[PDB]
Amino acid sequence: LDLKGSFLFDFEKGEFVKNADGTLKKCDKVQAYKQWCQKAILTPRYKKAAYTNIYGSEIKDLIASNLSQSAKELEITRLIKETILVHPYTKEVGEFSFNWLENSRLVEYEFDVLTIDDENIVIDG
Amino acid sequence: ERELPIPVFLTEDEDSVHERMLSNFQDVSTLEGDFIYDATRPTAEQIAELKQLGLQNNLKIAFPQTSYGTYLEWLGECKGVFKNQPTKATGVITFTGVQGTIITKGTIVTTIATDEKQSIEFELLETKTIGENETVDIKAESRIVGTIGNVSKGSISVLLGSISGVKSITNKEDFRGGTDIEDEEHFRERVLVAEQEDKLSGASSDYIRWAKEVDGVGYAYVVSEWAGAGTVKVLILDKNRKAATQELIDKVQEYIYPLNISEGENRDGKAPIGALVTVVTPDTLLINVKASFIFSNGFSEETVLNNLKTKIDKYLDKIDLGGTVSYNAIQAIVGSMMLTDEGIEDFSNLTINDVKENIKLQDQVVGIGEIVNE
Amino acid sequence: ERELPIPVFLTEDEDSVHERMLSNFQDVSTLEGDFIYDATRPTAEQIAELKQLGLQNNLKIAFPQTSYGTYLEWLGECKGVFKNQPTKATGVITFTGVQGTIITKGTIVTTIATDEKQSIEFELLETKTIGENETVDIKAESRIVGTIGNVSKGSISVLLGSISGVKSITNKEDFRGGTDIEDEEHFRERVLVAEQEDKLSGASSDYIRWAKEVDGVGYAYVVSEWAGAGTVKVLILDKNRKAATQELIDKVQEYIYPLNISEGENRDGKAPIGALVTVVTPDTLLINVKASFIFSNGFSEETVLNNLKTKIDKYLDKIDLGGTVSYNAIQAIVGSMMLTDEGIEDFSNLTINDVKENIKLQDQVVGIGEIVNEVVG
Amino acid sequence: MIASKKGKEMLLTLSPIYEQSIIMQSLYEAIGSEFDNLELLDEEIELQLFPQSATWGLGFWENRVGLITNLDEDMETRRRKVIAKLQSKYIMTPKRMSMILQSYTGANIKINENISPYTFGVELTSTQGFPKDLEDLYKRVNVIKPSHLAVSYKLVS
């Protein structure tokens, strides 16, 4: 497998975190994967020409859709789930939740599961 | 071959590109192993590579001076030059066998196949029956165009297929022809020659060209208007740049401007109609060089002198008819032999006709003089 | 690093040990969970763990091919090779505040500790007072060795305490004194590189080999006792035959014969004890060509001379140290442009540094001088 | 913000997170600068491909046709020499001879086809006039003309 690490990028500030040395702050494989996941979610699909069709999501386009609330909930689940699962490190994403806190303004949760989160059987002959 | 002097900015170094790449950054570590250095180095690698392999090669193939493939052939085409094609070798097979035995044209006869050589095949060009003396000579070609066809004599003693009656076959002659494709090197000069040569028609150069086309004409010189309007003179020399033989003058006369006339063939020479062309040999003023030559290893003095004779002989062509022979130019030719390591290590006391002075031709052609080691 | 072959015995399976242990029993049951099994199995398991871990690790640390850490260092000390040590970041810090304020040596100022990053501690190497100007600069050093530190220009901004009257502490320029511990594999390479058998006396051949080892040394020559007392001169030409630059000379000098040894130091260069060495480069003779050049119609005199300068210099590049300049061949270099009509219409009084004969170099290389048109009246 | 036109496009091609990234903006500003230079360089190569717009590559064209390459001469003079040199490869009809001489000089030329039995006349016209030296034109005409014909000249402003 041998996934590799990457460099931090504070999405709050929209800038790379760099040490006092001036070198960019490296970080772990798992940290890099979490960094990647948020970026892929925020990248719309088919539009940013640098990436292929695999990368990116389509959540923004769903806003203009005329589908009902429940239909939009399933589409959110499908879109987020499809976008994340392309990464090798993903094991499973699910347990989605939704809260239409206002009449038409939504908050939703979902839980991601890594490859390392798997449970291993203990036996040998 | 000729090199294209590309500008430096079109040949920037990768590191120079990378260094200019890192110049923009101000408050981030640009050291190796950093994101900025590591991420930008491949870009510099591609930018430099594209600049060199892309633009320079693209520009190079545009000109015939630095073209190699079909691009060169297209460039040669635009100025009328065409690469020579391969040809089959040819010759005669002396057959042997029972008189009356039939052998057909097109039969496959080869050389002796070996571990290091396949059966170099040949094709009979003639259908004939074995003659009175139990022999018959049949011409044949090489199935493969190129020098492979030009096999030696006696090599073709193999007949493919079951034909009895024939006792033996052989090639008495090492076959001839068998040209391969013209090389790039030869083709490039022909394209370069056509590009540089004006290639007019009716001008003095063409008269020289037609004169040199005649065999035996070493060097030719033409005077326009030697006797007024309509009058042309041709001044030819043998291969040694001496006075051309009268037959050579007659040959060049018949080639370019026959004196005899006919109603249909007015002159039918290479010269235009209305011209009045004269063909003679010029006054050959020898310029014998004498110097204290010092010669290098691995060379023969007489051979080196003949090479220097050929080099200076070329310079005499550069010298115009009635021109000025330059002592300084002769210093260039002599010293260049040393710079080229061509059998001369040192020289001194050079005197052309025993004088270190530039000589002016009086409407003559300088003839090649004797080179003397002092 | 090299993989470690292991003896078959040291890699025995746990069950194989236990099976051999139970081989002698044939009357009493040896089922798993039986009393005999209870007595024997922990011994067999403990043997396998100790045999596979404890003994194999001991074998690994034995040789420098696979040793590590302190163990690899000592094998370096067997053949007298030491790994490099780290250093503290060193630099200067600017201080601003009340003039009466005084800043003492040993004061601690750090970087901005955060959730993401911890603060890097630095110590002042000097005691100063702000009495003259509001601004003062104090040399400082990172309290921790290694490339940790070497911070950016404005990183140092934190004082652990609080000094009265100080208005602002800011580093002015990035620190540079830091360097980390040498890599184990690099040090392992150094341990294994130092395995030369002979050719170590410091003869002319040895010195030439040592000079050639330093990069940029195209050729090297040795003079024995050039100044007596076993002194050795090292005349070096660069890759392109040229005289070695001063930096290259210092590198070769320092590589073979260091000159910056302090009182508590000794030369580590390849030069053995008592063999005095000095690195030299020959003198580049300049060939100033003088002639009454005549140029063609409307052409640039500077352009033609520069092209001639390039042509001669290319020829001069072919010459070697102590070579012979061919004046008569140089005539044709000038005359080369005459044949090609490259500017020169004519020339006369062709000389090289006002000489009309071949010049022989002696402890000298030759370079292009100044092309001078005589313009004789 | 990125200044390079190419840099802005390349940055926009990536994910939109880099609005505030000074590092990424500075990075692709540098990358965009080089691609901008390459595009300008690429257009420059196109000019070299022809004798008319050869510019600094005109020496190559002069090298190609054997003309004496020389930088200090006027570029337009070098162009005119090259164009005339290339066109000398066909029949010396009055049309072709006129344009070759016209191209070399740059001034309008009319060949008279002189009345004399074996001479041809040349008449030149230029609004701006000429210098006092035009000998090299006569050198080329002597070289280029049919060997059996003399030549005459007259120059008009």
* Residue C199 phi, psi (nearest 5): 60, 65
E strand segments, chain C: 88-97, 102-103, 108-110, 121-124, 128-129, 135-145, 158-159, 166-171, 219-224, 232-237, 277-280, 283-287, 289-291, 294-295, 324-325, 344-346, 351-352, 359-360, 364-368, 372-373
Tokens of C161: 């305490």
| Contacts of B among chains (3+ CB pairs under 8 A) | A, C, D
Tokens of B147: 């020098």
Please write down the HEC assignment for all residues of chain A.
Answer: CCCCCEECCECCCCECCECCCCCECEECHHHHHHHHHHHHHHCECCCCCCCCCCCCECHHHHHCCCCCHHHHHHHHHHHHHHHHHCCCCEEEEEEEEEECCCCCCCEEEEEEEECCCCCCCCCCC
Please write down the HEC assignment for all residues of B311-333.
Answer: HHHHHHHHCCCCCEECHHHHHHH
3-state secondary structure of B159: strand
- CB of A21 within 8 Å of any CB in chain B? yes
Distance from CA of C17 to the nearest CA of A (A): 17
For D9, other C-beta atoms within 10 Å of its C-beta total 14
In chain A the first and final C-alpha atoms are separated, in Å, by 26
What's the rounded Cα separation, in Å, for the pair C102 and C125? 14
Tokens of C116: 């993401």
- CB of A125 within 8 Å of any CB in chain B? no
The label of the residue with tokens 């033609």 reads: C304
Phi-psi region of B71 (alpha: psi -120 to 50; beta: other; left: phi over 0): alpha
Tokens of D118: 């074996």
Question: Is there a contact between A14 and D16 if contact means CB atoms under 8 Å apart?
Answer: no
| Contacts of C among chains (3+ CB pairs under 8 A) | A, B, D
DSSP state of B236: E
Which parts of C22-173 fold into alpha helices (H)? 35-49, 56-62, 69-78
Pick from B124, B273, B185: nearest CA to B2: B185
DSSP state of B56: I
* Residue B14 phi, psi (nearest 5): -60, -45
- Option in B22, B50, B200 nearest D92 (CB): B200
Q: How many CB pairs under 8 A join A and D?
A: 34
Q: Give one DSSP letter per residue of B65-93, joined into a string.
A: GG--SHHHHHHHHHTT--PPPP--EEEEE
Question: Is there a contact between D20 and A15 if contact means CB atoms under 8 Å apart?
Answer: yes
Question: Is there a contact between B35 and A7 if contact means CB atoms under 8 Å apart?
Answer: yes
Please give the resolution of this entry in Å, rounded to 1 decimal: 3.4
Pick from B83, B159, B147: nearest CA to B119: B159
What's the rounded Cα separation, in Å, for the pair A84 and A37? 6
> What is the bridge-based pairing of β-strands C359-360 and C324-325?
antiparallel
For D22, other C-beta atoms within 10 Å of its C-beta total 16
Tokens of B111: 């050389």
- CB of A59 within 8 Å of any CB in chain D? no
Phi-psi region of C298 (alpha: psi -120 to 50; beta: other; left: phi over 0): left
| C 57-116 residues inside an 8 A Cβ radius of A | 111, 116
Q: Which residue of C has its CA nearest to A27?
A: C116
Contacts of residue A49 in chain D, CB cutoff 8 Å? 13
3-state secondary structure of C314: helix
B25 burial type by CB count under 10 A (0-12 exposed, 13-18 middle, 19+ buried): buried
Question: Is there a contact between C331 and B329 if contact means CB atoms under 8 Å apart?
Answer: no
Half-sphere exposure of C96 (CA within 13 A, CB side): 7
Distance from CA of A106 to the nearest CA of D (A): 22
Q: Which one-letter amino acid corresponds to residue C377?
A: G
- Say if CB C153 and CB C92 are below 8 A apart: no
- Say if CB B227 and CB B243 are below 8 A apart: no
Give the C-alpha distances (Å, rounded to integers) separating C41 from A123, C14, C47.
19, 9, 10
Half-sphere exposure of B146 (CA within 13 A, CB side): 6
Report the alpha-carbon angle A52-A53-A57, nearest 5. 115
- Say if CB B347 and CB B291 are below 8 A apart: yes
| A6, A9, A10, A46: best to mutate for the D interface, most D CBs within 10 A | A9
Pick from C303, C334, D62: nearest CA to B5: D62
Pick from C148, C138, C215: nearest CA to C177: C148
What's the rounded Cα separation, in Å, for the pair B236 and B255? 13
The label of the residue with tokens 């249909």 reads: B264
Pick from C90, C100, C108: nearest CA to C158: C108
- CB of D17 within 8 Å of any CB in chain A? yes
Give the C-alpha distances (Å, rounded to integers) separating D31 from C157, D10, D23.
34, 9, 12
What's the rounded Cα separation, in Å, for the pair B202 and C336? 33
- Option in C333, C335, C358 nearest B328 (CB): C335
Contacts of residue B23 in chain D, CB cutoff 8 Å? 30
Exposure class string for A52-77: b at 16+ Cβ within 10 A, else e = eeebbbbbeeeeeeeeeeeebbebbb
Tokens of D79: 């162009």
Distance from CA of B137 to the nearest CA of D (A): 49
Pick from B177, B170, B173: nearest CA to B148: B177
What's the rounded Cα separation, in Å, for the pair D32 and D11? 9
- CB of B25 within 8 Å of any CB in chain A? no
Q: Is the dihedral of CA C220, C221, C227, C228 positive or negative?
A: positive
> What is the bridge-based pairing of β-strands B276-280 and B231-237?
parallel
Please write down the HEC assignment for all residues of C217-244.
Answer: CCEEEEEECCCCCCCEEEEEECCCCCEC
What's the rounded Cα separation, in Å, for the pair D29 and B40? 12
Tokens of D150: 């003399």
The label of the residue with tokens 């010759």 reads: B91
- Option in D27, D116, D146 nearest B203 (CB): D146
What's the rounded Cα separation, in Å, for the pair C209 and C211? 5
- Say if CB B140 and CB B127 are below 8 A apart: no
- Option in B27, B29, B35 nearest A21 (CB): B29
Distance from CA of A93 to the nearest CA of B (A): 31
Pick from C171, C179, C117: nearest CA to C146: C179
Q: How many residues does chain D have?
A: 157
What's the rounded Cα separation, in Å, for the pair D63 and D40? 25
Q: Which one-letter amino acid corresponds to residue C356?
A: K
- Say if CB B146 and CB B179 are below 8 A apart: yes
For A43, other C-beta atoms within 10 Å of its C-beta total 19
3-state secondary structure of B272: coil
B229 burial type by CB count under 10 A (0-12 exposed, 13-18 middle, 19+ buried): middle
What's the rounded Cα separation, in Å, for the pair D155 and D153? 7
- Say if CB B187 and CB D75 are below 8 A apart: no
> What is the bridge-based pairing of β-strands B372-373 and B289-291?
parallel
Our CA dihedral for C79, C81, C83, C84, rounded to 10 degrees, sits at 170
In sequence order, which residues have a C-beta less than 8 Å from that of residue C263 and are 6 or more positions away?
none
* Residue C12 phi, psi (nearest 5): -70, 145
- Say if CB C217 and CB C244 are below 8 A apart: yes
- Say if CB C22 and CB C43 are below 8 A apart: no
Distance from CA of B38 to the nearest CA of A (A): 12
Our CA dihedral for B123, B126, B129, B135, rounded to 10 degrees, sits at -70
Distance of CA D69 to the CA centre of its chain: 13
The label of the residue with tokens 């040896």 reads: C30
Q: Partners of B135 in the beta sheet?
A: B96
Phi-psi region of C136 (alpha: psi -120 to 50; beta: other; left: phi over 0): beta
Q: Partners of B367 in the beta sheet?
A: B286
Half-sphere exposure of C329 (CA within 13 A, CB side): 24
Tokens of B178: 């068998």
3-state secondary structure of C198: coil
Question: Is there a contact between B328 and C336 if contact means CB atoms under 8 Å apart?
Answer: no
3-state secondary structure of B116: coil
Question: Is there a contact between A16 and D21 if contact means CB atoms under 8 Å apart?
Answer: yes
What's the rounded Cα separation, in Å, for the pair B7 and D56? 9
What's the rounded Cα separation, in Å, for the pair B102 and B165? 8
What's the rounded Cα separation, in Å, for the pair A68 and A63? 11
Q: Partners of C66 in the beta sheet?
A: none
3-state secondary structure of B252: helix
- Option in D68, D72, D73 nearest C341 (CB): D68
What's the rounded Cα separation, in Å, for the pair C90 and C88? 6
Tokens of C155: 């990183």
Pick from D48, D34, D9: nearest CA to B14: D34
Q: Partners of D152 in the beta sheet?
A: D121
What's the rounded Cα separation, in Å, for the pair D89 and D67? 15
Contacts of residue A8 in chain C, CB cutoff 8 Å? 116
Distance from CA of A36 to the nearest CA of B (A): 17
Q: C interface toward D at CB cutoff 8 Å?
A: 298-300, 303, 341
3-state secondary structure of B336: helix
Give the C-alpha distances (Å, rounded to integers) separating C272 from C233, C248, C279, D113, D133.
14, 21, 15, 94, 77
In sequence order, which residues have a C-beta less than 8 Å from that of residue B314 and are 6 or more positions away?
none
- CB of B355 within 8 Å of any CB in chain A? no
3-state secondary structure of C98: coil
In sequence order, which residues have a C-beta less than 8 Å from that of residue B203 and are 6 or more positions away?
D92, D143, D144, D145, D146, D147
Q: Which one-letter amino acid corresponds to residue B208?
A: I
In sequence order, which residues have a C-beta less than 8 Å from that of residue A29 and are 6 or more positions away?
A3, A4, A5, A89
* Residue B357 phi, psi (nearest 5): -140, 145
- Say if CB C195 and CB C268 are below 8 A apart: no
What's the rounded Cα separation, in Å, for the pair B263 and C270? 99
Give the C-alpha distances (Å, rounded to integers) separating C280 from C210, C269, C277, D111.
14, 17, 10, 74
What's the rounded Cα separation, in Å, for the pair D61 and D51? 6
Q: How many residues does chain C have?
A: 377
What's the rounded Cα separation, in Å, for the pair C319 and C241? 9
3-state secondary structure of C147: coil
3-state secondary structure of B357: coil
Question: Is there a contact between C303 and D71 if contact means CB atoms under 8 Å apart?
Answer: yes
Question: Is there a contact between A22 and B29 if contact means CB atoms under 8 Å apart?
Answer: yes
DSSP state of B206: H
| A21, A23, A25: best to mutate for the B interface, most B CBs within 10 A | A23
In chain C the first and final C-alpha atoms are separated, in Å, by 78
Q: How many CB pairs under 8 A join B and C?
A: 50
B75 burial type by CB count under 10 A (0-12 exposed, 13-18 middle, 19+ buried): buried
Distance of CA D46 to the CA centre of its chain: 13
| Contacts of D among chains (3+ CB pairs under 8 A) | A, B, C
Question: Is there a contact between D15 and A39 if contact means CB atoms under 8 Å apart?
Answer: yes
Tokens of A103: 């009449």
Q: How would you list the strands of the sheet with C121-124, edge to edge?
A: C158-159, C108-110, C121-124, C135-145, C88-97, C166-171
Q: B interface toward C at CB cutoff 8 Å?
A: 27, 315, 318, 326, 328-329, 331-336, 338-339, 346-348
- CB of B39 within 8 Å of any CB in chain A? no
Tokens of B89: 């070798």
Distance of CA B227 to the CA centre of its chain: 37
Half-sphere exposure of C236 (CA within 13 A, CB side): 31
- Say if CB C171 and CB C155 are below 8 A apart: yes
Tokens of C225: 């006792």
Tokens of A87: 């990464």
Pick from C147, C14, C26: nearest CA to C88: C147
- Say if CB B358 and CB B327 are below 8 A apart: yes
- CB of A48 within 8 Å of any CB in chain D? yes
For B175, other C-beta atoms within 10 Å of its C-beta total 23
* Residue B181 phi, psi (nearest 5): -65, 145
In chain B the first and final C-alpha atoms are separated, in Å, by 36
Contacts of residue C111 in chain A, CB cutoff 8 Å? 20
* Residue B185 phi, psi (nearest 5): -60, -50
Tokens of C28: 């009493």
What's the rounded Cα separation, in Å, for the pair C99 and C135? 8
What's the rounded Cα separation, in Å, for the pair B352 and C375? 26
Phi-psi region of A5 (alpha: psi -120 to 50; beta: other; left: phi over 0): beta
Distance from CA of B74 to the nearest CA of C (A): 29
Q: Give one DSSP letter per residue of C336-362, joined into a string.
A: HHHHHTSSEEE--S-EESS--SPEEPS
- Say if CB C120 and CB C175 are below 8 A apart: no
Pick from B226, B208, B204: nearest CA to B217: B208
* Element housing C315 (H / E): helix C301-318
Q: Partners of B221 in the beta sheet?
A: B235
Q: C interface toward B at CB cutoff 8 Å?
A: 152, 315, 326, 328-336, 338-339, 346-347, 358
Tokens of C356: 């009309």
- Radius of gyration of chain B measured on its C-alpha atoms: 31
- Say if CB B351 and CB B357 are below 8 A apart: no
